[PDB]
Write a protein that binds this ligand. Structure first.
Ligand SMILES: *O[C@@H]1[C@@H](CO)O[C@@](CO)(O[C@H]2O[C@H](CO)[C@@H](O)[C@H](O)[C@H]2O)[C@H]1O
Ligand SMILES: *OP(=O)(O)O[C@@H]1[C@@H](O)[C@@H](O)CO[C@@H]1O
Length: 478
């Protein structure tokens, strides 16, 4: 019995091109359309769902040859959804200068300039053997291939269409194939019974945008949706009171934040940014809106970093007196400052913002909410404060301090953070030295500079909750 699944989601990606879809809402869809060379075993080493041992997927085996090169032996007779066989040429193209990390590629895939490893051109040895190379040594290649940067695209078809058009009609090797995409509304995918792996267990999957969480909860209760995403702990008691429904919650390796358009004069200098940061009472927000289930990290520092996690690092500061001193020290004259939020695309975005407006009013800053619907984002020239999140997608502190906040990232490039010279030199250093006392200490200096400059303000790691019918035993919501 294969049912058609209807999933009520918090958002829909602007594209289904796998890298440009990187976001809180894209991967749950693109993970079903595309495959990677290797996958993480989420339950390896006794881990409760965040395990890291690597297992075969499109690559049946792989061997690290040297500190710059990894050879992947590919599964044979794997078919893209259009009937073309996947070969080493496709894998090579996926990680090529032309598609991903070269100068022209970064104009259409901005993450290819910040989220790429220091790749050199892949080498195709034969139809089913490819070597992934880096210009400088890195141990991260294999784990990177299991990440959201590693989804394999079809060379001929992708190159013919180009990145943007491919994103509207994606072709992959995954267990579901593309059917329909209605911008800011829905995505439909269908079972690919030509899949190389386990046969898909649903006939079709529809991801439908339901912007308000109470409407998602109501749709699950009425039977309109089989699964709904992005709920909060507050919704769990009501849902679990229905014997045919259930919730699942867990801390995610992602942090919610607010950030600034530092091209705006009000945020070109650190004092007012740091004043807004020091006025945030995170335990109060977590206690009021998250049932004390969201986690407050000790800085830009998460256990999944492994060798670059500092378990002894101090907490992020809360200092009303210093925030009040920094508002008056800045030229701040009482002019209202907008904070843009796409509703509750981030769980509790609007109630958290209303609480922070009160905290900011108490230090003399007037912040006004600007709540917009999907696709109605302001032009950057009209964005002042906004919310965002970062997924901590590697077992190394390189992600996201360096790949989002470093010199090649969007916080400096698009949003105008003039990072101190020491910060950008430390970014360069950590990316060229192995795990060691020096690298560990360098990441702590980066964390210290991040808190001093406040290009963004970490709020917490959300306790993500999804809900589903109990009789729906497979939930493609990643
Ligand atoms: O973290 C999201 C980031 C992804 O690049 O962009 C934002 C806006 O700053 O969201 C946009 O992109 C996603 C992914 O395509 C869409 O689903 C959103 O609707 C769009 O606002 C961040 O929220
Ligand atoms: O949805 P969103 O918060 O904007 O996505 C972020 C993405 O922009 C990048 O920071 C990685 O983490 C999340 O997916």
């Amino acid at each position: 019995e294969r049912r058609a699944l209807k999933i009520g989601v918090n958002g829909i990606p602007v594209t289904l091109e796998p890298i440009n879809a990187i976001s809180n809402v894209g991967p749950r869809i693109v993970n079903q359309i595309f495959d990677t060379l290797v996958v993480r075993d989420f339950f390896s080493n006794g881990a409760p769902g965040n395990g890291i041992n690597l297992m075969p997927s499109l690559a049946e085996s792989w061997e690290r040859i040297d500190d710059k090169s990894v050879r992947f032996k590919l599964r044979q007779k794997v078919m893209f959804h259009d009937g073309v066989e996947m070969t080493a040429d496709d894998v090579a193209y996926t990680f090529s200068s032309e598609r991903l990390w070269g100068p022209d590629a970064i104009k259409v895939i901005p993450l290819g300039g910040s989220y790429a490893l220091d790749f050199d051109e892949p080498v195709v040895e034969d139809k089913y053997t490819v070597v992934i190379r880096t210009k400088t040594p890195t141990p991260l290649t294999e784990s990177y291939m299991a990440s959201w940067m590693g989804r394999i695209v079809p060379k001929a078809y992708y190159k013919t269409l180009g990145t943007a058009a491919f994103g509207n009609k994606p072709v992959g090797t995954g267990p579901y194939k593309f059917v329909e995409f209605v911008a800011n509304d829905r995505v439909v995918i269908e079972a690919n019974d030509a899949y190389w792996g386990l046969k898909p267990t649903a006939s079709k999957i529809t991801y439908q945008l339901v912007a308000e969480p109470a409407t998602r909860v109501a749709g699950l209760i009425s039977g309109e949706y089989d699964i709904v995403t992005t709920l909060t702990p507050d919704d769990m008691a009501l849902i679990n009171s229905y014997p045919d429904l259930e919730t699942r919650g867990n801390i995610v390796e992602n942090f919610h934040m607010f950030t600034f358009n530092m091209n705006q004069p009000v945020f070109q200098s650190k004092p007012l940014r740091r004043a807004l940061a020091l006025a945030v009472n995170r335990p109060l927000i977590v206690q009021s809106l998250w049932m004390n289930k969201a986690t407050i990290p000790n800085g830009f520092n998460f256990p999944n970093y492994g060798k670059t996690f500092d378990p002894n690092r101090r907490a992020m500061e809360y200092n009303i007196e210093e925030a009040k001193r920094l508002v008056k020290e800045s030229g701040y004259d009482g002019t209202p400052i907008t904070y843009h939020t796409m509703g509750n695309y981030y769980a509790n975005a609007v109630p958290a913002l209303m609480m922070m407006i009160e905290m900011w009013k108490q230090i003399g800053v007037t912040v006004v909410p600007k709540v917009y619907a999907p696709g109605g984002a302001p032009k950057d020239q009209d964005s002042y404060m906004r919310n965002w999140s970062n997924g901590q997608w590697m077992t190394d502190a390189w992600a996201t301090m360096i790949c989002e906040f470093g010199p090649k990232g969007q916080v400096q490039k698009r949003w105008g953070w003039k990072a101190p010279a020491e910060f950008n030199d430390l970014c360069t250093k950590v990316s060229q030295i192995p795990d060691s006392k020096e690298r560990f200490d360098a990441f702590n200096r980066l964390r210290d500079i991040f808190e001093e400059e406040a290009p963004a303000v970490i709020l917490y790691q959300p306790f993500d909750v999804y809900a589903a019918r109990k009789d729906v035993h497979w939930r493609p919501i990643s």
